[PDB]
Scaffold this motif. Structure first.
Motif, short mmCIF file in Angstrom:
data_model
loop_
_atom_site.label_atom_id
_atom_site.label_comp_id
_atom_site.label_asym_id
_atom_site.label_seq_id
_atom_site.Cartn_x
_atom_site.Cartn_y
_atom_site.Cartn_z
N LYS A 83 -3.77 9.57 2.61
CA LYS A 83 -4.61 8.41 2.91
C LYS A 83 -3.77 7.20 3.26
O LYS A 83 -4.23 6.33 4.00
N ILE A 84 -2.56 7.12 2.72
CA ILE A 84 -1.65 6.01 2.99
C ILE A 84 -0.80 6.27 4.23
O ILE A 84 -0.73 5.46 5.15
N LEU A 85 -0.14 7.43 4.29
CA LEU A 85 0.88 7.69 5.30
C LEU A 85 0.31 8.35 6.55
O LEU A 85 0.97 8.35 7.59
N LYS A 94 0.81 -1.20 0.00
CA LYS A 94 0.00 0.00 0.00
C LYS A 94 0.85 1.26 0.00
O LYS A 94 0.41 2.31 -0.48
N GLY A 95 2.07 1.17 0.52
CA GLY A 95 2.91 2.32 0.75
C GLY A 95 3.10 2.75 2.19
O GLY A 95 3.64 3.83 2.42
N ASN A 96 2.63 1.95 3.17
CA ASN A 96 2.99 2.22 4.56
C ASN A 96 4.50 2.06 4.67
O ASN A 96 5.08 1.14 4.07
N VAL A 97 5.13 2.91 5.46
CA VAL A 97 6.54 2.72 5.77
C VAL A 97 6.64 1.52 6.71
O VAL A 97 5.86 1.41 7.68
N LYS A 122 2.17 11.37 8.97
CA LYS A 122 3.50 11.59 8.43
C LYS A 122 3.44 12.62 7.32
O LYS A 122 4.17 13.63 7.33
N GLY A 145 3.00 15.67 5.61
CA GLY A 145 2.86 17.02 6.13
C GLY A 145 3.17 17.21 7.60
O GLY A 145 3.00 18.32 8.09
N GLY A 146 3.64 16.18 8.32
CA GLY A 146 3.86 16.30 9.75
C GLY A 146 5.28 16.61 10.19
O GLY A 146 5.49 17.11 11.30
N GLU A 163 3.43 15.80 20.39
CA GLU A 163 4.38 16.82 19.96
C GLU A 163 4.81 17.77 21.05
O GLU A 163 6.00 18.06 21.20
N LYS A 178 8.01 23.02 11.76
CA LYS A 178 7.39 21.70 11.93
C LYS A 178 8.15 20.92 12.99
O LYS A 178 9.37 21.03 13.05
N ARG A 234 15.61 7.83 14.55
CA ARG A 234 14.89 8.43 15.67
C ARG A 234 15.87 8.93 16.72
O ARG A 234 15.73 10.03 17.25
N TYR A 270 7.39 12.73 12.92
CA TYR A 270 6.77 11.50 12.45
C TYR A 270 7.66 10.70 11.54
O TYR A 270 7.21 9.69 11.00
#
Ligand SMILES: CCCCCCCCCCCCCCCCCC(=O)OC[C@H](CO[C@@H]1O[C@H](CO[C@H]2O[C@H](CO)[C@H](O)[C@H](O)[C@H]2O)[C@H](O)[C@H](O)[C@H]1O)OC(=O)CCCCCCCCCCCCCCCCC
Ligand code: CLA
Ligand code: CLA
Ligand code: CLA
Ligand code: CLA
Ligand SMILES: CC(C)=CCC/C(C)=C/CC/C(C)=C/CC/C(C)=C/CC/C(C)=C/CC/C(C)=C/CC/C(C)=C/CC/C(C)=C/CC/C(C)=C/CC1=CC(=O)C(C)=C(C)C1=O
Ligand SMILES: CCCCCCCCCCCCCCCCCC(=O)OC[C@H](CO[C@@H]1O[C@H](CO)[C@H](O)[C@H](O)[C@H]1O)OC(=O)CCCCCCCCCCCCCCCCC
Ligand SMILES: CCCCCCCCCCCCCCCCCC(=O)OC[C@H](CO[C@@H]1O[C@H](CO)[C@H](O)[C@H](O)[C@H]1O)OC(=O)CCCCCCCCCCCCCCCCC
Ligand SMILES: CCCCCCCCCCCCCCCC(=O)OC[C@H](COP(=O)(O)OC[C@@H](O)CO)OC(=O)CCCCCCCCCCCCCCC
Ligand code: HEC
Ligand SMILES: CC1=C(/C=C/C(C)=C/C=C/C(C)=C/C=C/C=C(C)/C=C/C=C(C)/C=C/C2=C(C)CCCC2(C)C)C(C)(C)CCC1
Ligand code: OEX
Ligand SMILES: [Cl-]
Ligand SMILES: [Cl-]
Ligand SMILES: [Fe+2]
Lengths: 334, 202, 170, 30, 50, 97, 244, 36, 137, 33, 32
Positions: free
Chosen positions: I124-126, A300-303, I129, I131-132, C161, F97, A313, I136
């Motif tokens: 819808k996918i990410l 789907k494109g989820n990381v 994340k 724009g975050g 955040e 951001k 991180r 993220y």
């Protein structure tokens, strides 16, 4: 019998307890200047505004540091790569606040240390030696140039050169990781291989020679008294050491030629440390470690995170906290 | 609730919260415990009960986050103020105490409420005498901790002793060095069928 | 990175002794190899000096004497005893690794050298006091808050955040 | 007191250097 | 709070023969913004170490 | 007696609406028609005694007055907090951001 | 015939205010009717004096000289504002904008650093009534605002701050927080300062004037951590006047 | 300061010339085997 | 999970009509977004003005609404500020400014649609994340 | 600084006890030959 | 008891230093 020629004879004499030489003529003053300034600064220098934001960092013992936290603090970001000798300051008080002493020390040290390497060539020539011991020391020397000169030049400020202190060192290497992902850089990985491998082969060689000392002593005396300085006979049995080590692995992974073996000992840590010095020297121009952040995604494109994303991180937390008052705009471009 | 039970439910007695060079008794850090203050109950302005997230042992410091019975974050102590949505001030967080010294007391002034929430991450809240020992406020480990540290370290070092003296037992004949008349044929390959057994020449 | 943020492992004297043991090992390895190769006796006519060793020769293949004068004159002290030298080569990296092992045993129990108490008391009271020790703990603090949720998913850490520690702009 | 201790030890090491170099056991041949 | 209230033993022997100021800009007579040159208390101490 | 004034201001209308006297200018993106143009003007003409004073801003077109009326319920006014207006922090408060 | 950047850069002259010919002893006359602006006001300090703390009760400490350690970074420049004619003929300059602050740190004898925000922010400065001409005896007196040296985002070395940062001493988790309130709770000071500007040169042709200034203001209090020192600043100024 | 600058320029020039002329003084010949 | 038609289904206009992209259009749009837009909008943020992002809710509150193919294709032709009050072609890539922004020269009308589609599909996918920002990552 | 008082005695002994041990053994070594 | 905490180190060195001196001299005596 002439004056200059007698001086030249003393400078280059193989009879001085410590060899001087023409490289010595520059080395000795510059290392005395750097040593003396370092010692005084470490004990009693006042705080230095490393980052150019009028936020001085206390580095010396009398200002509340111990041996572990103290440092000569790098000169001010406001100075950048400008030369800041004493006589360019209105006063010593200013020179101290802005971090003058770091400059004095690193320039004198890098000079004297370059002459140290040359002095190694020189005495090698006066004694009828082969000449390349100095080539082995070029590895540590290149490393010191990278963190004191090259990385500042590329990032545009001696404020980003490595501090002269124990915790300052750690500060430098943490910030480096956030800004360059040095762990994921192949040249640092070769440094580790050169340094882990170096300690390994050190232990190996020492344990093999030590395992094959020929009995010359009794159980009530140090084995070391079995060797006499300047004896012509070798003091261990190399065929016995080859016979043990080649059976510990297999024959052909073991050295029976002491010359190849000792040349191997020299080249492995030297070449590894060349590369890691080259690592710092090229990350100085922001050619950073491999970036595999979000490199794996699903249908789907989820990381799908990997261990590289976890490293990211941690790098992020270093990035956003370091020099917490010095950035006004969103990207830390140097 | 007996005070003894409530004192176990407090991270300052967790043996995994100390440091190597933080010396002395646990009382030197947080102090000499005097009384259970009471069990703290946080509520937002909507009367929902909120639960302080407890510090895990791994963390020297830990943020203050309040959740509902379902895990949803409903308040915190923010770091950056300008975009905070969940401040105690905005959420109207109060604290009430049941049991202990503070039983039946409720506090609403934000600074005080934040202050008990700061402690509630350590579990149950106690009053300490910090002055008698000039306690510095930093957790130390217990005898459980020190004893384990010392015996795990001694054990590891005694493994080396085992290796050293066992080697010396089995190799006593060459302690001082190897035979000066070892011949390369014993050490070279194939000479003997069985390694070191001179009775198996070809 | 975990050990830096959570244990401040670089501050630990047992790690520091390991560092000296590995780095001093690597130095010994290189300086001993280079010395041998550059105090060789001329035992053959060729420019490749490897050919002129024989594993069964009695003779040392390099000059301990010239090696010792060289290093005495360059560095002030030198080895004079080949047995001691090669034992020292065993001794240094082995001991260093043993020391680091001990420190990690301490960290098994979270028994860290995390802090200097004297620094923290002064810094709590004096907001103008800053050292490399305090600068590095801000970084540890960043590390923990920013990596913990993804690195310990079973803890279900949710850090909105506004609670993340962050300097200006970044 | 901690400052004095640190510098004192450091000073001892420098003195030791002096003796180790100039007052060493002189290596003697064979 | 003069020197003799603070247990100073050698500071008065320097003061006695003319050394009265410090490179940090104070003098024992309570005058600020002084430049003693090299022979301040600090420089006398240095010269005895050398 | 030692109060963090920013935290105290989170307990006011400042913490629930766009405060025309204090809030950084990026808040005006949350409602349509207000950024950059009207937000620029609202900020430069602060401070306001009442939410309704925004409409007396000289130069407002009638379309601009409509947008503000459409959004008066999303605004408030509290006292100017020095800490929030100094440093040009209403134009850039260090948050991206 | 003015200079270029590349003639100035690195000289230190960028931190100096323009000077008026020592011939310039004229007078700029003021038309009550017409309006006027100051297109450039430059203030170049030369001396920083700090009030000592005299410990007793009736000795009142003096101003002592200090040593500057922040280099040629001190001057206010490109300052502009309205220049109004009051009913009784006094003038009043109202600052609008400009590089009207510089952080400065000077060093007292003994080593103590004193940071300060050298500023004229929101300056209003008036003359005596009945001016009609600016002359080599015209004086301006006024007051300005002195905000906190650090603004609200500034994080102390343990990560504590006013608009960002921790609210406690996190390295001392079970310490008693009452001793630490002063260091834990940051406060944004906002104080006033006073300035006198003494005109001593005037170019009647061009409307340029110049002279001496003295201001008095408070030093940095490190967000309420400690008590400020009183500071007196002497220097020279130059300004240029335009018909608005 | 200008007195310090002068002094350092002088000391440095001195040592750098010792170095240049020292190596110009037949350095190849100062070895133990073949002198030239 | 996969790139189903429901996720590839995005608003065409404010009227409420909708359009279903193909996988091809989606990957086409992703590629073109990297070519022409990611230097400033990597991950849905805006590096040179972080206050304006590519999240669907932000686009929705833009004047004119940009949470749809029509609004986005228009924006790529004649970009305006967020309140619609001025045209910013001089400083934002656009077909109207392909002379100063050369990368827009060879973008065709269907290219624009694939790019606008990518922008509306990716949130819808990410999720947050998109724009975050680094929080993220 | 508010520093562990016993650090001083600890450091002095840490230095002094092992150093004196070494000196004792060295000096009686020289008195032999 | 509010004793002088430099007394511990003064007492300890008072004993250790001169005692070590004696021991050193005695042992090197017994070995010649
Ligand atoms: C082992 C084998 C090798 C052989 C070894 C040979 C042995 C010799 C070892 C040398 C020992 C060096 C010791 C360090 C010297 C540095 C002292 C210093 O820097 O001392 C300098 C002093 C200190 O200056 C004062 O320094 C102070 C610095 O303050 C700081 O320090 C203060 C004191 O600690 C406080 O802490 C204060 O808060 C803090 O700000 C103030 O700024 C004063 O205003 C300022 O005057 O200055 C003075 O007046 C000094 C005079 C200079 C005046 C300017 C004229 C220039 C003269 C040229 C100098 C030539 C040098 C000789 C070269 C010639 C070669 C033929
Ligand atoms: C197990 C983990 C591990 C290991 C084995 C290493 C290993 C290494 N790292 Mg990496 N590193 C790690 C983790 C690790 N690192 C992590 C986690 C981080 C990120 C936080 C980093 C960040 C990092 C950085 C940022 C750098 C390294 C560097 C290095 C190298 C240091 C040794 C060196 O430079 O020698 C080279 C030798 C010297 C520097 C010695 C110079 C000696 C001079 C010439 C003489 C000095 C004389 C002295 C003053 C006086 C002595 C005389 C006496 C009488 C007093 C080495 C390859 C450094 C490197 O590659 O530098 C090139 C470097 O800059 N690492
Ligand atoms: C198994 C041994 C053991 C254990 C677990 C304990 C445990 C404890 N003791 Mg006890 N104690 C012991 C042995 C032990 N003791 C012995 C042998 C003595 C006589 C000296 C004492 C005398 C004693 C006193 C006087 C006091 C305690 C106290 C305490 C408590 C605090 C300890 C502390 O702060 O440690 C701190 C631990 C360290 C700082 C670690 C030190 C180890 C160093 C770092 C290692 C050295 C490294 C070495 C040089 C490396 C080089 C090697 C290389 C060259 C090859 C704790 C419950 C205190 C207390 O609270 O009692 C009420 C107290 O006042 N103990
Ligand atoms: C690195 C580990 C190691 C090494 C190299 C040695 C080496 C040596 N030991 Mg020591 N030993 C060890 C660990 C080790 N030991 C441990 C952990 C113990 C128990 C605490 C012992 C107990 C011991 C005794 C009591 C004696 C020796 C002796 C010896 C010497 C002769 C060889 C011998 O007996 O081997 C021992 C062989 C082994 C340790 C390997 C055994 C492999 C085990 C059986 C496999 C277990 C599989 C297990 C079921 C997996 C499932 C478990 C899972 C659920 C976790 C030699 C010096 C003797 C000696 O000194 O003579 C002079 C002697 O008397 N050893
Ligand atoms: C100058 C930089 C530097 C240096 C020199 C070191 C050096 C060291 N670090 Mg430190 N480190 C540094 C920086 C550095 N560190 C920094 C900045 C950090 C961040 C806090 C750390 C964090 C860190 C951690 C987290 C740890 C260390 C550890 C170590 C030690 C590793 C010992 C070792 O060889 O393990 C190598 C591993 C072994 C020897 C184990 C056995 C290996 C067997 C024999 C493998 C055999 C392989 C097999 C045959 C086949 C492999 C094939 C396959 C690859 C294809 C050593 C003392 C470790 C330590 O102290 O351990 C006690 C450790 O856990 N370091
Ligand atoms: C003014 C103030 C106070 C200044 C403060 C400055 C400052 C910050 C000081 C801090 C000091 C600080 C705390 C340092 C701590 C260092 C540290 C961590 C301690 C290590 C402790 C510890 C015991 C570690 C355990 C591991 C250990 C055993 C490591 C030993 C490393 C070591 C000594 C290795 C040897 C290195 C070395 C240079 C040897 C060269 C030997 C040499 C002469 C070889 C030449 C040679 C080669 C040949 O091949 C032949 C043939 C011949 C003949 C020959 O000669
Ligand atoms: C022979 C003696 C001469 C040698 C002594 C040399 C001194 C060595 C000192 C080393 C100990 C360092 C002491 C520093 C602590 C101190 O100053 O505070 C002194 C601390 C006691 O702590 C004191 O307690 C007081 C109330 O009783 C107050 O709390 C004081 O504040 C606190 O300082 O000393 C100890 O606790 C001593 C016992 C430690 C023994 C446990 C070690 C267990 C760990 C095993 C480690 C093995 C590692 C081997 C690795 C190889
Ligand atoms: C050499 C190795 C060490 C040798 C043994 C060392 C111990 C020797 C005894 C030292 C004196 C003991 C004093 C108690 C310790 C102490 O508290 O002192 C501590 C005092 C200092 O006092 C400290 O001062 C501090 C402020 O700096 C605070 O006031 C502390 O409270 C206070 O303890 O040490 C001294 O004052 C130094 C001694 C110098 C005395 C010189 C004058 C005496 C000359 C007379 C000698 C005649 C002898 C005739 C014999 C025949
Ligand atoms: C002009 C430039 C000259 C540079 C000056 C530098 C001089 C300092 C070098 C060492 C002097 C002390 C060595 C004493 C010890 C001594 O005299 O050893 C002498 C010893 C002689 O060995 P031999 O093989 O002769 O000994 C054989 C038997 O006697 C053994 O029983 O040499 C070694 O063992 C080499 C390895 C020691 C390596 C130690 C070097 C580490 C020193 C640096 C550590 C400093 C940390 C300080 C931090 C503050
Ligand atoms: C920097 C050089 C940019 C490039 C390349 C692209 N964009 Fe951009 N974009 C940029 C800025 C500075 C801004 C803000 C403009 C303003 O003042 O309002 C934008 C804005 C957008 C928007 C509007 C977002 C919103 O919240 O409504 C969109 C939809 C947008 N940009 C899209 C976009 C596309 C499709 C690009 C590639 C063709 C592209 N941008 C490039 C800066 C830059
Ligand atoms: C009295 C007093 C005190 C104390 C003191 C002390 C503690 C001291 C010590 C001291 C010491 C402890 C000293 C020592 C010294 C040392 C020395 C004197 C050294 C020398 C060295 C040298 C000479 C060297 C040389 C060299 C060379 C030449 C070459 C190269 C190498 C070398 C470097 C080696 C106090 C402060 C309390 C107070 C006051 C008084
Ligand atoms: O200074 Mn030192 O650190 Ca290299 O980046 Mn930018 O700058 Mn600062 O930040 Mn990150
Ligand atoms: Cl930092
Ligand atoms: Cl920036
Ligand atoms: Fe060897």
């Amino acid at each position: 019998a002439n004056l200059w020629e007698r001086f030249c004879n003393w400078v280059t004499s193989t009879d001085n307890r410590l060899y001087v030489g023409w490289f010595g003529v520059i080395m000795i003053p510059t290392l005395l200047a750097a040593t003396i300034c370092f010692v005084i600064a470490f004990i009693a220098a006042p705080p230095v505004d490393i980052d150019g934001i009028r936020e001085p960092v206390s580095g010396s013992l009398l200002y509340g540091n111990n041996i572990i936290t103290g440092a000569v603090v790098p000169s001010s970001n406001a100075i950048g790569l400008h030369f800041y000798p004493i006589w360019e300051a209105a006063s010593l008080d200013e020179w101290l606040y802005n971090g003058g002493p770091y400059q004095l020390i690193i320039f004198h040290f890098l000079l004297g240390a370059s002459c140290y390497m040359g002095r190694q060539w020189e005495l090698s020539y006066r004694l009828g030696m082969r000449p390349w011991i100095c080539v082995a020391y070029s590895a540590p020397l290149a490393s010191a140039f990278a963190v004191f000169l090259i990385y500042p030049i590329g990032q545009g400020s001696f404020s980003d050169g490595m501090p002269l202190g124990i915790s300052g060192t750690f500060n430098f290497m943490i910030v480096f990781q956030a800004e360059h992902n040095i762990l994921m850089h192949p040249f640092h990985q070769l440094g580790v291989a050169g340094v882990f491998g170096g300690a390994l082969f050190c232990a190996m060689h020492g344990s093999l020679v030590t395992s094959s000392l020929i009995r010359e002593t009794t159980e009530t005396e140090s084995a070391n008294y079995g060797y006499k300085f300047g004896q012509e006979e070798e003091t261990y049995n190399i065929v016995a050491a080859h016979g043990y080590f080649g059976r510990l692995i297999f024959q052909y992974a073991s050295f029976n030629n002491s010359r190849s073996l000792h040349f191997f000992l020299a080249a492995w840590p030297v070449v590894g440390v060349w590369f890691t010095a080259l690592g710092i020297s090229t990350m100085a121009f922001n050619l950073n470690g491999f970036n595999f952040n979000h490199s794996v995604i699903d249908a789907k494109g989820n990381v799908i995170n990997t261990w590289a994303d976890i490293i990211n991180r941690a790098n992020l937390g270093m990035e956003v906290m370091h020099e917490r008052n010095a950035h006004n705009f969103p990207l830390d471009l140097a | 609730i007996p005070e003894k039970l409530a004192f176990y439910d407090y991270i300052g007695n967790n043996p995994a919260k100390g440091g190597l060079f933080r010396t002395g008794p646990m009382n030197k850090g947080d102090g000499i415990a005097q009384a259970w203050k009471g069990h703290a109950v946080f509520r937002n302005k909507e009367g929902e009960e909120l639960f302080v997230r407890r510090m895990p042992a791994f963390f020297e410091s830990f943020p203050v986050i309040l959740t509902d019975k379902n895990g949803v974050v409903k308040a915190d102590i923010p770091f950056r103020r300008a975009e905070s949505k969940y401040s105690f001030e905005q959420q109207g967080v109060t604290v009430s105490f049941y049991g202990g010294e503070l039983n039946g007391q409720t506090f609403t002034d934000p600074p005080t409420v934040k202050s008990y929430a700061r402690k509630a991450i350590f579990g149950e809240i106690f009053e300490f005498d910090t002055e008698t020992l000039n306690s510095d406020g930093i957790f130390r480990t217990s005898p459980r901790g020190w004893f384990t540290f010392a015996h795990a370290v001694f054990a590891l070092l005694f493994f080396f002793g085992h290796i050293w003296h066992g080697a010396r037992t089995l190799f006593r004949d060459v302690f001082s060095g190897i035979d000066p008349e070892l011949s390369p044929e014993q050490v070279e390959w194939g000479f003997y069928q069985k390694v070191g057994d001179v009775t198996t020449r070809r | 990175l975990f050990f830096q943020g959570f244990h401040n492992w670089t501050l630990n004297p047992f790690h520091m002794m390991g560092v000296a043991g590995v780095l001093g090992g690597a130095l010994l390895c290189a300086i001993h190899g280079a010395t041998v190769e550059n105090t060789l006796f001329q035992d053959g006519e060729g420019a490749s000096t490897f050919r002129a060793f024989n594993p069964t020769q009695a003779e040392e293949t390099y000059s301990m004497v010239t090696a010792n004068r060289f290093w005495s004159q360059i560095f002030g002290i030198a080895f004079s005893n080949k047995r001691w030298l090669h034992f020292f080569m065993l001794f240094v990296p082995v001991t260093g690794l043993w020391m680091s092992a001990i420190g990690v045993v301490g960290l098994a129990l979270n028994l860290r050298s995390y802090d200097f108490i004297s620094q923290e008391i002064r810094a709590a009271e004096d907001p103008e006091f800053e050292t490399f020790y305090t600068k590095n703990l801000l970084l540890n603090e960043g590390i923990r808050a920013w990596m913990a949720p993804q690195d310990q998913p079973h803890e279900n850490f949710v850090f909105p955040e506004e609670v993340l520690p962050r300097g200006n702009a970044l | 007191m901690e400052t004095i201790t640190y510098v004192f030890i450091f000073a001892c090491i420098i003195a030791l250097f002096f003796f180790a170099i100039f007052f060493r056991e002189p290596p003697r041949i064979t | 709070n003069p020197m003799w209230r603070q247990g100073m033993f050698v500071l008065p022997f320097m003061a006695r023969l003319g050394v009265t100021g410090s490179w940090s800009g104070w003098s024992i007579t309570g005058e600020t913004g002084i430049d003693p040159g090299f022979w301040s208390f600090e420089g006398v101490a240095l010269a005895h170490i050398v | 007696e030692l109060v963090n004034v920013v935290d105290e201001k989170l307990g006011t209308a400042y913490g629930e609406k766009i405060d025309l006297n204090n809030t950084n200018i990026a808040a005006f993106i949350q409602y349509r028609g207000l950024y950059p143009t009207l937000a620029k003007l609202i900020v430069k003409n602060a401070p306001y005694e009442s939410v309704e004073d925004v409409l007396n801003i000289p130069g407002l077109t009638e379309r601009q007055k409509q947008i503000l009326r459409e959004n008066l319920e999303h605004f408030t006014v509290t006292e100017v907090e020095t800490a929030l207006v100094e440093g040009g922090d209403r134009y850039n408060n260090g948050l991206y951001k | 015939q003015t200079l270029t950047y590349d003639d100035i850069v690195g000289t230190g002259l960028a931190n100096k205010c323009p000077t008026l010919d020592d011939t310039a002893r004229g007078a700029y006359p003021i038309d009550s009717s017409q309006t006027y602006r100051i297109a450039r006001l430059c203030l170049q300090p030369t001396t920083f004096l700090v009030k000592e703390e005299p410990k007793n009760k009736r000795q009142e400490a003096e101003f002592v000289p200090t040593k500057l350690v922040t280099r040629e970074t001190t001057s206010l420049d490109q300052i502009q504002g309205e220049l109004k004619v009051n009913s009784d003929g006094s003038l009043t300059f109202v600052e609008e904008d400009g590089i009207d602050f510089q952080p400065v740190t000077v060093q007292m004898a003994g080593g103590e650093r004193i940071p300060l925000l050298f500023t004229v922010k929101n300056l209003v400065a008036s003359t005596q009534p009945n001016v009609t001409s600016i002359t080599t005896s015209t004086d301006f007196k006024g007051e300005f605002n002195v905000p906190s040296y650090r603004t609200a985002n500034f994080l102390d070395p343990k990560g504590r701050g006013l608009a960002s940062g921790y609210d406690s001493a996190i390295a001392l988790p079970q310490a008693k927080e009452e001793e630490l309130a002063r260091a834990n709770v940051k406060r944004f000071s906002l104080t006033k300062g006073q300035i006198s500007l003494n005109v001593a040169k005037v170019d009647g042709r061009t409307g340029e004037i110049a002279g001496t200034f003295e201001s008095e203001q408070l030093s940095d209090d490190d967000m309420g951590a400690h008590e400020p020192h009183e500071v007196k600043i002497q220097g020279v100024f130059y300004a240029s006047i335009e018909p608005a | 300061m200008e007195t310090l600058k002068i002094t350092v320029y002088i000391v440095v020039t001195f040592f750098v010339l010792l170095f240049v002329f020292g190596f110009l003084s037949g350095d190849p010949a100062r070895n133990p085997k073949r002198k030239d | 999970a996969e790139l189903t038609p429901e996720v590839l289904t995005v608003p065409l206009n404010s009227e409420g009509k909708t359009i279903t992209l193909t996988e091809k259009q989606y990957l086409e749009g992703k590629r073109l977004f990297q070519y022409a837009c990611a230097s400033c909008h990597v991950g849905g943020i805006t590096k040179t003005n972080p206050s304006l992002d590519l999240r669907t809710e932000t686009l929705a509150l833009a004047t004119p609404p940009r949470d749809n193919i029509e609004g986005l294709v228009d924006y790529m032709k004649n970009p305006t500020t967020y309140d619609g009050e001025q045209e910013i072609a001089e400083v934002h890539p656009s077909l109207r400014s392909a002379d100063i922004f050369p990368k827009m020269r060879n973008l065709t009308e269907k290219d624009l649609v694939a790019i606008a589609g990518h922008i509306l599909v990716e949130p819808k996918i990410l999720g947050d994340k998109w724009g975050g920002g680094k929080v993220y990552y | 600084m508010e520093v562990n008082q016993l650090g001083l005695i600890a450091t002095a002994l840490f230095v002094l006890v092992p150093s004196v041990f070494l000196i004792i053994l060295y000096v009686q070594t020289e008195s032999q030959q």
